[PDB]
């Protein structure tokens, strides 16, 4: 099964929470990274996680409202209008083969 992602909810009230669920994570992994946008891109990395150190180190796009979980889920709390749009997960497998998945959600007001 190919790597999917999914947002809970897809439409998000400003001020509140969203959870980017990840389906079909491979079992053996070097690590993973989330990004803002539709692409894997250094300057837009929200956060990276090394299985090796069970340790999450944030990149430049991180707003400090993100929690990453070892099942690759990303939680974003207190969402603003600008959090709206696309997100991309890159999983690196133990054999240095990668996989991507793009995620999306919309944030409305009040």
């Amino acid at each position: 099964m190919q790597l999917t992602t999914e947002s809970m909810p897809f439409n998000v009230a400003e001020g509140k929470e969203v959870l980017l669920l990840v389906h079909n994570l491979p079992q053996q992994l070097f690590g993973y990274s989330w990004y803002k946008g539709e692409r894997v891109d250094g300057n837009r990395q929200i956060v990276g996680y090394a299985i090796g150190t069970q340790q999450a180190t944030p990149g430049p796009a991180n707003s400090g409202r993100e929690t990453i979980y070892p099942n690759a889920s990303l939680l974003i709390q207190n969402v603003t209008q600008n959090d709206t749009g696309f997100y991309t997960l890159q999983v690196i497998k133990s054999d240095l083969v990668n996989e991507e998945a793009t995620g999306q959600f919309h944030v409305y007001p009040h």
């Binding site: 070097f30 250094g42 090394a50 090796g52 990149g59 430049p60 690196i92 497998k93 133990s94 083969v97």
Partner: protein
């Protein structure tokens, strides 16, 4: 003249020990430390993960390291089904128990290429010699396409080649980068995805110690050479020399033996079936360690066997004083 008899024994043993190769256990012990590290790298080096960002993921740092033969990439990864990605290991911060940085890997690659070149072409110099000079080629690639080649004047003398060895062992043991997972050697189907010091902890320890003891052997050889043997004054001077020189011979054999012991530690675990072998040569040691091992045993046993001479030389000196 019974003294002159022991003097000759001390010298000729010291000449073998400090200036020989085939028949010196100091030499073969040293060579074995060096060749061991080389096999260590030929045997599992390819599976070391490198590329982790130093400053930030926004650097897409990435470089190819050439062994010639093959090339190794740091930074990148493979796209599911085919293509090469420029985003990969460079996407995650480098540190202990995760990844080596480009800079760390290039230190190793340089040391390796030097060790590899010295040993294959010049051979390890006799411990007592300043060594020949030689030129290692180190070669790398990038994209933006740029190929770089460093030519290093260097020497094949124990202290130099041991620093090269040391740079590789220390990095692995202090940083314990993860190994690539999945024909496949035993340890890979067992340690890929997990730090290298959890697969090869024992082996890096043993290697660390071989380098130390080899280093210490070199020290003692320098200062063995310092002391090479009719009033009281000549009977004391060249006689203190006897004690100093025998005490050196012994310590050297002690360390040469300890190196044989660490080699066993080295080669008794996951590398038992791989280092020692050869024949793309990654995955086995291809370093002549088996040759060097039996010769270290043989030579060491010859000297061991000559331990009366050193017992019975040390008495004569103590008698005098």
């Amino acid at each position: 003249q019974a003294i002159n008899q022991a003097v000759n024994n001390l010298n000729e043993r010291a000449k073998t020990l400090a200036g020989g190769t085939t028949n010196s256990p100091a030499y073969q012990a040293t060579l074995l430390a060096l060749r061991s590290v080389l096999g260590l790298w030929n045997s599992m080096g390819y599976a070391v993960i490198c590329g982790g960002y130093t400053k930030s993921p926004g650097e897409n740092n990435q470089k190819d390291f050439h062994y010639t033969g093959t090339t190794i990439n740091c930074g990148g990864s493979t796209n599911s089904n085919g293509t090469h990605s420029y985003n990969g290991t460079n996407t995650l911060k480098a540190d202990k128990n995760v990844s080596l940085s480009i800079e760390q890997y290039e230190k190793i690659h340089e040391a390796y290429q030097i060790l590899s070149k010295a040993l294959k072409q010049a051979g390890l110099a006799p411990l007592n010699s300043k060594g020949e000079k030689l030129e290692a080629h180190v070669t790398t690639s990038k994209y933006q396409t740029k190929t770089t080649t460093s030519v290093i004047d260097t020497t094949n003398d124990a202290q130099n080649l041991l620093t090269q060895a040391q740079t590789i062992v220390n990095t692995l043991k202090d940083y314990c980068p993860i190994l690539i997972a999945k024909n496949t050697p035993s340890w890979q189907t067992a340690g890929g995805g997990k730090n290298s010091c959890a697969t090869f902890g024992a082996e890096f320890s043993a290697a660390s110690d071989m380098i130390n003891n080899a280093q210490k052997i070199v020290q003692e050889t320098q200062q063995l050479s310092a002391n090479q043997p009719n009033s009281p004054s000549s009977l004391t001077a060249l006689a203190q020399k006897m004690l100093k020189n025998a005490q050196s011979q012994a310590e050297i054999l002690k360390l040469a033996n300890q190196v044989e012991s660490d080699f066993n530690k080295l080669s008794s675990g996951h590398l038992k079936d791989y280092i020692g072998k050869c024949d793309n040569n990654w995955g086995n040691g291809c370093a002549g360690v088996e040759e060097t091992q039996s010769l270290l045993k043989t030579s060491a046993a010859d000297f061991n066997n000559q331990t009366p001479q050193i017992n019975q030389a040390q008495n004569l000196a103590n008698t005098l004083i």
